[PDB]
Amino acid sequence: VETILEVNNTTEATGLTRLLIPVSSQNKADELCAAFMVDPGRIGPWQSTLVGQICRYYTQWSGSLKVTFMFTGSFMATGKMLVAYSPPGSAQPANRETAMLGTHVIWDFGLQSSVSLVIPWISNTHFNYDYYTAGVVTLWYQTNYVVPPETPGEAYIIAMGAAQDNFTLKICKDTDEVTQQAVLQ
Amino acid sequence: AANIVLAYGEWPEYCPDPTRPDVSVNRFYTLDSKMWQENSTGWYWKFPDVLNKTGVFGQNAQFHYLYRSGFCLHVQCNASKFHQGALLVAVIPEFVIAGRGSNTKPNEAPHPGFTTTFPGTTGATFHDPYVLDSGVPLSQALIYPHQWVNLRTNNCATVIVPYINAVPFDSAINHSNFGLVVVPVSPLKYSSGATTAIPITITIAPLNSEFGGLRQ
Amino acid sequence: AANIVLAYGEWPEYCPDPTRPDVSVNRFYTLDSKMWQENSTGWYWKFPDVLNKTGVFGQNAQFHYLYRSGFCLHVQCNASKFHQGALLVAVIPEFVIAGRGSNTKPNEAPHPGFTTTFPGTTGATFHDPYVLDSGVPLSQALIYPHQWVNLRTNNCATVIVPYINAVPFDSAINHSNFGLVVVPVSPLKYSSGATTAIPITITIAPLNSEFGGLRQ
Amino acid sequence: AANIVLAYGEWPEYCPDPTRPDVSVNRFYTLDSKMWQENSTGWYWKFPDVLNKTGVFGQNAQFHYLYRSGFCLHVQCNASKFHQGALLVAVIPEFVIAGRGSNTKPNEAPHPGFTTTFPGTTGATFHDPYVLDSGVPLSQALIYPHQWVNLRTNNCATVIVPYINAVPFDSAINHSNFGLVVVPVSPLKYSSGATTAIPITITIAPLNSEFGGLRQ
Amino acid sequence: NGVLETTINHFFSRSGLVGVVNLTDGGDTTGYATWDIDIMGFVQLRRKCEMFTYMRFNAEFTFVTTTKSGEARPYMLQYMYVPPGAPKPTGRDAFQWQTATNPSVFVKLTDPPAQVSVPFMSPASAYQWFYDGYPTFGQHPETTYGLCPNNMMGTFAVRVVSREASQLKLQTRVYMKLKHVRAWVPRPIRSQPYLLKNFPNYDSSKITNSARDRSSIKQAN
Helix, strand or coil, X not given: CCEECCCCCCCCCCCHHHHCEEEECCCCXXXXXXXXXXXXXXXCHHHHCHHHHHHHHEEEEXXXXXXXXXXXXXXXXXXXXEEEEECCCCCCCCCHHHHHCCEEEEEECCCCCEEEEEEEEEECCXXXXXXXXXXXXXXXXXXXXXXXXXXXXXXXXXEEEEECCCCEEEEECCCCCCCCCCCCC | CCCEEEHHHCCCCCCCCCECCCCCCCCCEECCCEEXXXXXXXXXXXXXXXXXXXXXXXXXXXXXXXXXXXXXXXXXXXXXXXXXXXXXXXXXXXXXXXXXXXXXXXXXCCCCCHHHHCCCCCCEECCCXXXXXXXXXXXXXXXXXXXXXXXXXXXXXEEEECCCXXXXXXXXXXXXXXXXXXXXXXEEECCCCCCCCEEEEEEEECCCEEEEEECC | CCCEEEHHHCCCCCCCCCECCCCCCCCCEECCCEEECCCCCCEEEEHHHHCCCCCHHHHHHHHEEXXXXXXXXXXXXXXXXXXXXXXXXXXXXXXXXXCCCCCCCCCCCCCCCHHHHCCCCCCEECCCHHHXXXXXXXXXXXXXXXXXXXXXXXXXXXXXXXXXXXXXXXXXXXXXXXXXXXXXXXXXXXXCCCCCCEEEEEEEECCCEEEEEXXX | CCCEEEHHHCCCCCCCCCECCCCCCCCCEECCCEEEXXXXXXXXXXXXXXXXXXXXXXHHHHHEEEEEECEEXXXXXXXXXXXXXXXXEEEEECCCCCCCCCCXXXXXXXXXXXXXXXXXXCCEECCCHHHCCCCCCHHHHHHCCEEEEECCCCCEEEEEECCCXXXXXXXXXXXXXXXXXXXXXXXXXXXXXXXXXXXXXXXXXXXXXXXXXXXX | CCHHHCCHHHHCCCCEEEEEEEEECCCCCCCCEEEECCCXXXXXXXXXXXXXXXXXXXXXXXXXXXXXXXXXXXXXXXXXXXXXXXXXCCCCCCHHHHCCCCCEEEEECCCCCEXXXXXXXXXXXXXXXXXXXXXXXXXXXXXXXXXXXXXCCCEEEEEECCCCCCCCEEEEEEEEEEEXXXXXXXXXXXXXXXXXXXXXXXXXXXXXXXXXXXXXXXXXX
């Protein structure tokens, strides 16, 4: 089941606005909108999802994941984004141009209101200096956000993700997600 | 009508061989529309409640001791091409709101009032929707039977839900089988001069109903 | 996708029986979009240049002494229904810009600089488009393989061009087979409040490529 | 060519149904020859390292996150009929050198440096070969896949080794699957006036290669 | 209604004047005259073969020679054609003129004109008058842009055959007919005037409009 990621989690929008990442007219083309590492099992955007919370109960996982975007802008608005995935071991893509050379999808809002990107493979392995390098997915402005007159010039992307059929987990363990220790009474 | 959500992949059925009101209860009930605006925080309807005091369906439920049925829900949102936003239409079984404003004791713990638990025909409104007032993470609400109604794309959402419960029959007044939660994930935005408040209309058809234990 | 322009009514083919990079070079390259506004004068890309310094295609071309291929070009323009204008998308073989600012002698004649002749990945911009900077009449540019992209109607233009040249193989760095000219015949107009600058995205797929003479 | 050593009696194969570079990586790489003389103590090459920074094979390995392949190794020694000696050519999996110069503690134990662990294209040289710098008895090194190259008899040694590891795929930069150890068991002897130093040439063909996880 | 006048071959037929060369005998310094073959020379035929990109054809040259006063006299002339790549005659008496591989036609001045044909000489499959790029492969570090050696068609040179110098003065009108013409991938035809001989360069300030103006848009003559 694909559930919403929090890609904007930082100390600014605190609320239901923590689930939404923006786009605007003022942002020039060919610059970064947002990025997030893809791993279910570490802190950050995946702690909100099931696949993220369900991987806390198991030590080892691996398989393919499915990341999906949805555009809430107006029917009149148009533009393009470049959503690209850099495999683990490669760092943050610095430029759209180098980002394009990897695995990407050009996604035009006017045509599709939703895009989907299948990250091929991802799993954990051990044996905080390790810091578990994994892939990241970035979302770039291909073209500036085009809007007609008398229409809002600011919109939100909403990102959600889930595992696919070959995703598996093993070696059960309890979660650190709760420190509560027996409310009772 | 493009896509219907069929809850849990299973159709409503009658009692698996307790009476049936023929076709008499089969018809659309259209609730008072909710007016959605920039700051709107969401709504919910405890479902075998909303129809309790209104209609021919309502007279049966109050006068019968046991109750069974499924439903078909249509949620329409009328708005221009210059408005934008998104709503999350979900049907979540045994939806139980919670006391907020923490005071933790056996005594003074602030339990919800009846008007807050069972809202009635006019539904209720989330204080803080981020937790769905359940303490649970809304970002995971997509588990339940759900549909996105996104003004950019189709403005209608329809969901059929079967009767679900641990028992075959249960009281219509006391127990609320499922609630219907409508939240404005991405806030409504509009340019100056457009109509400010967008209506939300929910139509519900109690298909496949049963009653029993009439009270003179 | 409604209409493709197939240049000179002939499809790309391989060498008429020099190696082939299997399918390895087959994929879309998406150039940095150009930002078109009221006063925009047009753009051009010397084509077996644009890809010279970028991509897996670029490493082959710089490291191989001979080169052959055709192309498939897609030019999209995103813009509202309130914007208006028209562009002329043409692929013109052996496009040679010219020294303007006349001084006629054997010596001081102002020849173009390399950055002006081969623009690179970011393309270049016409000083005076009326002559296409060739001294030739743009109103006749419709001879070449061309498409109109008119914001009133479809916003996409696609053109397939075969490899054309007097010789079967030629160097990728020195010789630029064809240029791609995009001109705003009718200027862009928009009402106050609309987005000011309209992007132009050109995607190019080096289909049917060959290389030879690798240099260690 | 008289005798090939086929390591562990099993041929290289592809992934047991992750991509393949067609035949593109199939060709001989010839390392800088080592100059063997009276006092020479031996050499070694951590193998999926030697090719890491050199060649088309090298660009793939550095730019791909996973790696798989076997190899074919040819070790030739050119020398007259008046020279004499013997070498032991062995391919020993997971060859791990060791800190010598004992200081036994949790802290100051002299671990090897990176240049000593992974030598690079030029290989490295045993301090004391009698233990193979593993602490293990060289006189038992004949366990591994091995060949004697004895100047009295044939001067060539060829060994094919399959890909061996506990996992199907592994990183090319970090993990060195097998090392190649060449030791001068019986020292080189020559009469006065003969050429003093005998070259040793090792040619390696990365047959049956696979890569995956490209990094732009 | 006969299409034959519009074919691409008939359009380039009809030998015109592609050049004129003058000859005077002091006997030593310049006793000869040389003319490189260039069809870009005049503006009528240039503007025609610049509406195409690749062209393949044959050339047929006819040499009309008269004297300054115009009245002939039976002096013998030599027309040497040095194919592309051969060295050009550096003097009336130079050893270039006895090279066997440079064809020649000895014809007297009082005869009808001399006439020869030239094949298609390029190493390429067709000429190209528009070349975008650089001739050099040597990684030009960066006036050499656009000029391709491939179009060199050779050269003619003219002398008077004699042991001593003859004081006559001549000029040679050279008419060229263009045969078996194939043409590819057409261009638009030039609006602007030409400035430099061999280059497209034009005048940016003086640009002339393609169509002569009129009074108002809605009044038709």
